[PDB]
């Protein structure tokens, strides 16, 4: 059951390099990434999935220097996912989203399609013109995908760890993200933990509900 | 299987008001909220869980004006969760987190406790003093909790919808959040969909992976 998974999952501190995802697991993690929800189904994201040693080495360049403890995680995991957010809101993307919704058969009429597009544009306009927070808004949706992903991969029986401990400017330059209109936010290595993962046997710790939660 | 869950879940557009969470499901959703991961185990969040008519009516005040379509969802769902983020980083919270980790038995020595606290404080200081983005950073963690929650509730067999379509200023004032140092970000009604939920029978739509995903 999913509660057992939420209580048993942990942030892996060390991965077993000999243990690779099955072909089926590799496809499943890509499905999890794709099918996350997002505000207005905006999907304001790109994913880099590194599974070769060369690919993972390129991602790990971002952990050089101050983030050296992140490096082994990045190199030793089977697959490494880099979660990127769109930095500017392009109208091309919004059209792409609604054209895909149309192709998938979500609209009964042209008028329903037009209304969906109008709603999405309105929301995007509120964030960019009224709140001046569109970059933040898009990044929040990516963090939502990360949360979905971490629970999903645990429910597949895989070990993972979310990493903010890397240099985003280096990762951006390594993959040319700035010019494509993306920024890297979170790196998530995925695989199986090794016997050196000290966190696997430690109790989980959270604040009590009487501190964080009010019932009304 | 979790992939089936991710592919079958949907944003509910209409709830069945007669269909309530079981007592056990109500406890399980609160556990999901508590046990989400967060950067540095910072847990920079508060949750309001409304299950009474009075409670849910208070939340639904925020679905006024531009947000009237959110009102039915908030009133008709069994339980409504408001996800709030801390707005100022208080040192009291950071001390509380590490004191809880200590009580749960995560540290072998006083030196390991001190190092954990030092790391957490360093990270918090980078966001507040160097990046000037601490509010954004805390809100990102709450969105991560939301993504965890949405998949978890689906795996429990419950329907949900995430809502950004509400008036946060009204919700903040209704519960006195500003003075407590929180801001409401996302409202998630939880329950069972009704036969009027038009989204339950529509195909799910996402951009193809050849647009959103690069393998390296
Ligand atoms: C957004 C995010 C960023 C994180 N960054 C790191 C990181 O850079 N290095 C690391 O060792 N752990 C990292 N963690 C793991 C957290 O410390 C961990 O989630 C938290 O202590 C709760 O423990 P758990 O994940 O075992 O439940 C990160 C977690 C999240 C959610
Ligand atoms: C952060 C967030 C905010 C959302 N806000 C709303 C909302 O205000 N009203 C609504 O009807 N749906 C809202 N949605 C639902 C999205 O439109 C939805 O996730 C997506 O279009 C439909 O895909 P799904 O059925 O896979 O969730 C929100 C989704 C997310 C992730
Ligand atoms: O996804 C939606 O339908 C949505 C998102 C934000 C605001 N209003 C609607
Ligand atoms: O949670 C952690 O261990 C963490 C978070 C950010 C950066 N470095 C470490």
Author numbering:
A (entry chain B), B (entry chain A): 2 to 217
Q: How did the manuscript describe this experimental structure?
A:
Escherichia coli NfsB has been studied extensively for its potential for cancer gene therapy by reducing the prodrug CB1954 to a cytotoxic derivative. The natural substrate of this flavoprotein enzyme is not known; however, it reduces a wide range of nitroaromatic compounds to hydroxylamines and also reduces quinones to quinols, with a bi-bi substituted (ping-pong) enzyme mechanism. The enzyme is a homodimer of two 24 kDa subunits with an extensive dimer interface. The two active sites are on opposite sides of the long central helix at the dimer interface, and the FMN is bound to residues from both monomers.
Our most active mutant in E. coli is T41Q/N71S/F124T/M127V, in which the additional M127V mutation enlarges the small channel to the active site. The structure of this mutant was determined at 2 Å resolution. The side chain change of this additional mutation is too far away to have a direct effect on the active site of NfsB; however, the M127V mutation enlarges a small channel leading to the active site. In NfsB, the main opening to the active site is as shown in Figure 1; however, there is a smaller opening to the site, approximately at right angles to the first one, shown in Figure 7. In the wild-type protein, a protein bridge, formed by F124 and Y68 side chains, is above this small channel so that it is only large enough for solvent and small ions. In the triple mutant, two smaller bridges form between M127 and Y68 and between N67 and F123. However, the mutation of M127 to the smaller valine allows the side chains of Y68 and N67 to move slightly, opening the channel. This could allow larger substrates to be accommodated in the active site. The steady-state kinetics of reduction of CB1954 with the T41Q/N71S/F124T/M127V mutant shows the highest kcat of all the mutants to date and a much lower Km for CB1954 than the wild-type enzyme, so it should be much more active with the prodrug. The quadruple mutant has the highest activity in the colony-forming assays in E. coli, with about a fifty-fold increase in sensitivity to CB1954 over the wild-type enzyme, similar in magnitude to its decrease in Km for CB1954.
